[PDB]
């Protein structure tokens, strides 16, 4: 009689797949076959921030689009002023093993996590004039793969324990615990409204969790391997996922399908970072092939290459205003393109 | 034209840069190692004069006459996590520790070595094989035949020839012969010499890296 319950799981999976198939009246490529291609996106290395001594693993543009934080394996979280390249801050981390970093939208706080399994939140606005860890969120049983700020008080984090956690910084306890992922969670992205967040895991699946409910609204299974990076569309009704299978995939929440796929026969490496331009027409994917590819969101056609790195592009980010892109690689350099 | 505030910001930026570079030197004379092996292979007491300093990553520091080695022990079965591994790519050399008197589990150790020796990230780091429990192997070789846990088996089935056979079996899984080097040392647990071996291997690897950078070979 135990298999009678799994019969329900099979029936629900069949219903979901049938609904997805019946809802695909056309394809994005076919619909976008009568638009002007972007052409060639020839960006240039406007700035080259050279402060780190090890492999930079994460970065996050500030809300002002001028200040950016970057975490390195050398135990340093450096806050840079992109316009002038001056290091506005250089916080020494307790644990050198850092794999994520985040800049608060208000800019008053910064976050960093890693193999320590604890998210350290530092306050950049202190009357003492020095950046000190304001909070040490703990409870995750695995390494922190990503974390993003919703406000000065709440923070969403994803760990290697196959689960995510929404923490209230003041209390220091997990307000919400998102569970359901079968593999380690590698990246998360917050929606523009900061109400639903999309998380990718090693189980080749992406889940659109609800911040105010703690439930997986939808699950997307289109990738063939680990989902390393994820980013929402600027509209907020769609997102993109980069995977180790050398293929990016653009899904839509309302359709709950794989709207488009980006892949090339000459690209066999894994995607390390994914980001969207201000208008969402350009999807910048930082690969392990030492290069970044600017794919056309609506056409799946490569539009340019930001080849300036001697090692893999671990992290990629786009300014809020869309003025410039920032790519941080394992070569310990962070280059701002425009 | 740069404003006074901008000039002061540049001064602060250079002060932070000099902080980073001073700490860079201070760390630069410290070598990061990676320690692997089976649970009972002898990971805990490989050096025997250490001082342990979240999950896994049991860092342990020691020194030998000019260097501060920091071995980052990685939890069991974590040698192929694919997520912590790329973190330990700056490791100067790996310190894999095997167990000679572990025939039944020997294959597993070999497999683990094959995983780390041929790993994409750990393709150039020079393993340092530590065939531990040589004392127990001494009696076991003369008591338990190695052919029990080896197809080719040992011809003479003696302590020396069998030990060499096991060492070579560990070494044979080094397809990238000309890219990396593997050092072997048959410790006996109660030996105050493993630190010297690690220091010698690390110095050799550092000299080789410097020669490569200079382009000599």
């Amino acid at each position, epitope marked *: 009689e135990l298999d009678q319950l799994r019969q329900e799981a099979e029936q629900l999976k069949n219903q979901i797949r049938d609904a997805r198939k019946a809802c695909a009246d056309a394809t994005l490529s076919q619909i976008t076959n009568n638009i002007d291609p972007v052409g060639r996106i020839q960006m240039r290395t406007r700035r080259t921030l050279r402060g780190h001594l090890a492999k930079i693993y994460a970065m996050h543009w500030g809300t002002d689009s001028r200040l950016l934080v970057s975490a390195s394996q050398d135990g340093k979280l450096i806050i840079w002023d992109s316009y002038t390249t001056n290091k506005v801050h250089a916080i020494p981390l307790r644990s050198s093993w850092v794999m994520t970093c985040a800049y608060a939208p208000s800019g008053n706080y910064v976050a960093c996590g890693g193999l320590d399994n604890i998210c350290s939140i530092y306050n950049l606005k202190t009357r003492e004039g020095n950046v000190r860890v304001s909070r040490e969120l703990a409870g995750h049983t695995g390494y922190l793969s990503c974390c993003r700020f919703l406000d000065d008080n709440q923070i969403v984090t994803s760990s290697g324990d196959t689960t995510c956690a929404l923490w209230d910084i003041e209390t220091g306890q997990q307000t919400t615990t998102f569970t359901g992922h079968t593999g380690d969670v590698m990246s998360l992205s917050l929606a523009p409204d900061t109400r639903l967040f999309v998380s990718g895991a090693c189980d080749a699946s992406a889940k659109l969790w609800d911040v105010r409910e703690g439930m997986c609204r939808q699950t997307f299974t289109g990738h063939e391997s680990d989902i390393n990076a994820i980013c929402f569309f600027p509209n907020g009704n769609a997102f993109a996922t980069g995977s180790d299978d050398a293929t990016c995939r653009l899904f839509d929440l309302r359709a709950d399908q794989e709207l488009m796929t980006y892949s090339h026969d000459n690209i066999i490496c894994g995607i390390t970072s994914v980001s969207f331009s201000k208008s969402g027409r350009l999807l910048l994917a930082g690969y392990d092939d030492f290069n970044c590819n600017v794919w056309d969101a609506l056409k799946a056609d490569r539009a340019g290459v930001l080849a300036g790195h001697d090692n893999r592009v671990s992290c990629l980010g786009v300014t809020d205003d869309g003025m410039a892109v920032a790519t941080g690689s394992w070569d310990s350099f962070l280059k701002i393109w425009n | 034209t740069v404003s006074a505030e901008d000039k*002061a910001a540049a001064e602060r930026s250079k002060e932070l840069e000099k902080k980073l570079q001073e700490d860079a030197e201070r760390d630069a004379r410290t070598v990061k190692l990676l320690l692997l092996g089976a649970d009972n292979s002898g990971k805990s007491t490989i050096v025997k004069q250490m001082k342990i300093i979240t999950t896994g990553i049991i860092e342990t520091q020691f020194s030998f006459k000019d260097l501060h080695f920091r071995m980052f022990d990685v939890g069991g079965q974590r040698s192929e996590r694919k997520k912590w591994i790329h973190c330990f790519e700056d490791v100067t050399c790996i310190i894999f520790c095997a167990d000679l008197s572990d025939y039944n589990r020997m294959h597993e150790s070999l497999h683990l070595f094959n995983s780390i020796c041929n790993h994409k990230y750990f393709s150039t780091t020079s393993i340092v094989l530590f065939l531990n429990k040589k004392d127990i192997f001494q009696e076991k070789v003369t008591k338990v035949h190695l052919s029990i846990c080896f197809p080719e088996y040992t011809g003479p089935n003696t302590f020396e020839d069998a030990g060499n056979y096991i060492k070579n079996q560990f070494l044979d899984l080094n397809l990238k012969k000309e890219d990396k080097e593997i050092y072997s040392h048959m410790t006996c647990a109660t030996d105050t010499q493993n630190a010297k071996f690690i220091f010698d291997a690390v110095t050799d690897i550092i000299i080789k890296e410097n020669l490569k950078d200079c382009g000599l070979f």
Partner: single-chain antibody, 233 residues
Framework: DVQLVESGGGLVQPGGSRKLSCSAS????????MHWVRQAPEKGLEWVAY????????YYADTVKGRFTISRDDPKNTLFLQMTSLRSEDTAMYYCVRSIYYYGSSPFDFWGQGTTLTVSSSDIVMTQATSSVPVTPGESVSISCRSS???????????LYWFLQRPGQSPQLLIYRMSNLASGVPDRFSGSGSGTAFTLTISRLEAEDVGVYYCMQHLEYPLTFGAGTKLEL
């Protein structure tokens, strides 16, 4: 708690030498530049000297160049001003002012209780011609300041600082860069203006708004303060 204590001030003959000390406690003094600003017995503030973080850069006022030497001992968290050949014009209260320079910073945010030093008997002019401003609680006021040279730099920052000195209290930063409200300042204060004309507006004057408001330019050294608009009941 941020604290700057001044000491070493007293009576010195016209020609002697003295060493004013400023002890800093409660913040990373090593990472903070320090200014020396002197207020005459009845005149306004005047920037005397400045030392940058790490002692890399040092600046002196035109009237004290060659006679005043500014130094710092970071391990001791101390700042020293050695004055030699002290003229009668040096009689004033000296304040050591904290200042950190980085994007989004608040230079001159905190001041220290000044020490009295009594002596026995190409600059951006800033005009503040509103010394007298009678007002009462519950009203709104608008102090005005002018600059000979525009303080709006090409980078988009207008380097104008509005400070307030209450009766018996050291100056406190109210507005920095003509638009940003300093930490701890009530929101009623609002700095505005453009080009060479700037204004500080107080909507509802409370009992803590009585005192002398000073306007200073940080575009380029030497730093010049305003005459000082006195709001009294």
């Amino acid at each position: 708690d941020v604290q700057l204590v001044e000491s070493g001030g007293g009576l010195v003959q016209p020609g002697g030498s003295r060493k004013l000390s400023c002890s800093a406690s409660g913040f990373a003094f090593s990472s903070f530049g320090m200014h020396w600003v002197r207020q005459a017995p009845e005149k306004g503030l005047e920037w005397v000297a400045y030392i940058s973080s790490g002692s890399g850069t040092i600046y002196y006022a035109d009237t004290v160049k060659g006679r005043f030497t500014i130094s710092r001992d970071d391990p001791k968290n101390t700042l020293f001003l050695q004055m030699t050949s002290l003229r009668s014009e040096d009689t004033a209260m000296y304040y050591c002012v904290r200042s950190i320079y980085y994007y989004g910073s608040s230079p001159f945010d905190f001041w220290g209780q000044g020490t009295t030093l009594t002596v026995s008997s190409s600059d951006i002019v800033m005009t503040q011609a509103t010394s007298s401003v009678p007002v009462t609680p519950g009203e709104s006021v608008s102090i005005s300041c002018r600059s000979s040279k525009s303080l709006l730099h090409s980078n988009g920052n207008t380097y104008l600082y509005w400070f307030l000195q209450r009766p018996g209290q050291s100056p406190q930063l109210l507005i920095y860069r003509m638009s940003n409200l300093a930490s701890g300042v009530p929101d009623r204060f609002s700095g505005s203006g453009s080009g060479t004309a700037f204004t500080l507006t107080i909507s509802r004057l409370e009992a803590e708004d009585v005192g002398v408001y000073y306007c200073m330019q940080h575009l380029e050294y030497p730093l010049t303060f305003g005459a000082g608009t006195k709001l009294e009941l």
